Design a protein around this nucleic acid. Structure first.
Ligand SMILES: [Mg+2]
Ligand SMILES: [Mg+2]
Ligand SMILES: [Mg+2]
Ligand SMILES: [Mg+2]
Ligand SMILES: [Mg+2]
Ligand SMILES: [Mg+2]
Ligand SMILES: [Mg+2]
Ligand SMILES: [Mg+2]
Ligand SMILES: [Mg+2]
Length: 62
RNA sequence: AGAUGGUAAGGGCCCACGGUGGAUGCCUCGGCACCCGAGCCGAUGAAGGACGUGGCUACCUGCGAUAAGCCAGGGGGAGCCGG
């Protein structure tokens, strides 16, 4: 289900849009990094948070 | 004075039961032949690779830093996150 919702809202990134396709992505990635840091230290990650993010970004990157 | 009897360190044949070995039978996801179909790919970067890519990933597979994946259309109708 996660699809429909986000992607629609994602061309909804059209106030500023490619500029925001971008801005958003950047923010999305910092999250991934923050997230896989938590990931590696162990005592701060529960998995799919990762996958789900990476794929936000593949979609975002569209 | 005399006579021919038991011994088995070990060995031989026979039976029995094991070990080892992987023949025989059955099996088959593979192979072989024929026939039909189909028959080009590439600078819009092929064929084929290297290195990567999974929360934990050695390999195989898939994929390409959007990395076992992204979008859309079609199919399908309870399961799914490969081996
Ligand atoms: Mg005598
Ligand atoms: Mg004897
Ligand atoms: Mg003896
Ligand atoms: Mg015995
Ligand atoms: Mg890795
Ligand atoms: Mg990882
Ligand atoms: Mg790993
Ligand atoms: Mg591989
Ligand atoms: Mg890219």
């Amino acid at each position: 289900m996660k699809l429909s919702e986000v992607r629609k809202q994602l061309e909804e990134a059209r106030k500023l849009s490619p500029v925001e396709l971008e801005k958003l992505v950047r923010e999305k990635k910092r999250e991934l990094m923050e997230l896989r840091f938590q990931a590696s230290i162990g005592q701060l990650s529960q998995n799919h948070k990762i996958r789900d993010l990476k794929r936000q970004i593949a979609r975002l990157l569209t």
